[PDB]
Design a binder for this molecule. Structure first.
Ligand code: CER
Ligand code: CER
Ligand code: MN
Ligand code: MN
Lengths: 332, 332
């Protein structure tokens, strides 16, 4: 009768399986810089912007012309293994990548066809910059909770190679334009997939509780000074919302799985919220920003390291273009 | 305890408001054909493929460089008026268009910012070719049903002008390639938006019951002979599913609001299912295929014509690239 925060949380939604794919090829910021040197020289800019301002030592790239759907499909096969279920069990497949094979059909229908889903399997893409994998989790969770389905896949493959190819070409003949282009050189490749399920079908798997979103769509035109200040302001509001629904206090969370934009942005965020940096696994310095796949890759890598115990409270969160901010909880 | 079809239907989800935007400019197939004549002549093809095979007399185009987000925003303003609510009430805004301003941020965040949504408003894009507006309705419905929100916007703006510009340029210097390009000349421009709400907040508005999806993702590579046969096979399965959940028999539905691909595809569909053509409003011959906006535009135009009575059972359905097929019901 009387609303309470906890009411909107999911009771019956679990994480059956989880996997990631590291893209194989290392591209160092040192090697990029040699290609950019002569235009560093010409513009008169003596600063290693990627290595010294962003904090990226390297990113991963695909070795071949991998489509988003291929990377997602690889990750999905691994996640099904992790969940020990066959594709016939999946009732929903949501693709959340920024990378996209086509305008139509959906990347999800391409991945679904690759995997061999059944005729009952609903499929579509969600796009929301860096936050879409959490949005896909929540969309799937609602359907699991209600019982419309028993198992869902949420998949995300990202490819940056053609971005890099083109960006590096376009900054080897203006400072204003050239500084805009440096930011694409912090992106990386990779994939992730998650099998979600109804909790009773999967007794004692990790629980997805759901979470909260706040937005500042007034800022949909985004600098980087401004992405940062407005982004932190938005996160603050969002943490209030998380307190009100999830009961969050920063000190009670065991791990923060955080979308990563750059070394200084992350530092600023963790400082502003008094987060312990030891609870913030980071892959940005050697993998770059994997867009919406960053959050589930980091979760999967935490899992694989044996970094988690039954009961551990894991915060999934990011700030995305929009601006949007989403915060959700997994209890391992 | 025992599942029944009706269980998954939404009980508490209504349609508060609905609007569409007709794009202003008429472009006749006669005028296109004069531009294509000399390449009709060169390839030796004497058939009016657009006028005589597709059945499109004209399509609507924008007069100016309208972005999808602008068209969606226009439609959304009209829908809020139709619902007699201000933007502050909206808790969710989903954009479903194929047309898209950017890779990031979402088109939805751009529309949200234009409208002035509150900081509590969740936003994202769903992409699923021609069926995404029904997918967006259902995603919103789940959140309305559970009470996470009270009012949602589902918006869709489409623009084909740059498609036309480029396609007409690219077929005025191979038959195989040229026939592939004729199909883009059946697309049209337009927009639609829908305000959904919790039924008690909106006593006696149209009810959204939800619906069903079946898929044939084996066919994500799609001819047109094959789009048709496999598409009808898929629709047949989907109608079985609709029977099992919604209780559908074709003769008990009052109106069929059907995504439209072409005159012969529609004819084939309606024949194959024994549908009465008088219950199938069509705008394709003068507006062309508006992609995922086609279904809500047709619904809105039915509304505006005074074509609906309290209690009327309206079938929303389409076949989309994937292949996917979705079928849902509104009770006016
Ligand atoms: C901590 C503050 C961060 C400011 C936000 C920047 C937006 C980041 C990006 O551009 C992408 O990496 C993620 C995204 N945009 O959705
Ligand atoms: C009635 C049979 C139809 C065959 C399906 C064709 C796909 C149609 C399209 O290409 C678009 O108009 C709609 C869509 N593809 O999602
Ligand atoms: Mn290599
Ligand atoms: Mn005009």
């Amino acid at each position: 009768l009387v609303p309470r925060g906890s009411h909107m949380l999911f009771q019956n939604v679990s994480i059956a399986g989880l996997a990631h794919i590291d893209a194989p090829h290392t591209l160092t910021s040192k090697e990029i810089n040699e290609r950019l040197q002569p235009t560093y020289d010409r513009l008169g800019i003596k600063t290693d912007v990627l290595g010294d301002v962003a904090g990226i030592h390297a990113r991963r790239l695909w070795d071949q012309d991998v489509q988003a759907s291929d990377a997602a499909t690889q990750a999905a096969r691994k996640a099904l293994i992790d969940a020990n279920i066959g594709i016939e069990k999946i009732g929903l497949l949501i693709n959340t990548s920024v990378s996209r094979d086509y305008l139509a059909p959906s990347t999800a229908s391409i991945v679904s066809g690759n995997l061999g889903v059944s005729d009952h399997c609903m499929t579509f893409d969600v796009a929301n910059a860096c936050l879409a994998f959490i949005n896909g989790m929540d969309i799937a969770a609602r359907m699991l909770e209600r019982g419309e389905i028993d198992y869902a896949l949420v998949v995300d493959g990202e490819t940056a190679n053609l971005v890099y190819e083109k960006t590096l070409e376009r900054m080897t003949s203006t400072e204003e334009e050239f500084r805009n282009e440096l930011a694409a050189l912090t992106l990386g490749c990779g994939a992730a997939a998650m099998v979600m399920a109804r909790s009773e079908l999967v007794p004692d798997a990790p629980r997805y509780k759901g979470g909260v979103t706040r937005s500042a769509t007034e800022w949909n035109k985004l600098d980087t000074r401004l992405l940062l200040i407005e982004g932190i302001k938005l996160a603050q509001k969002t943490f209030v919302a998380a307190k009100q629904v999830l009961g969050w206090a920063v000190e009670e969370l065991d791990q923060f799985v955080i979308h990563q934009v750059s070394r200084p942005h992350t530092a600023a965020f963790v400082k502003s919220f008094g987060i312990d940096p030891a609870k913030v696994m980071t892959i940005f310095g050697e993998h770059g920003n994997i867009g919406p796949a960053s959050v589930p890759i980091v979760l999967s890598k935490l899992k694989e390291l044996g970094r988690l115990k039954k009961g551990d409270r894991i915060a999934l969160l990011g700030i995305g273009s929009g601006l949007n901010c989403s915060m959700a909880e997994v209890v391992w």
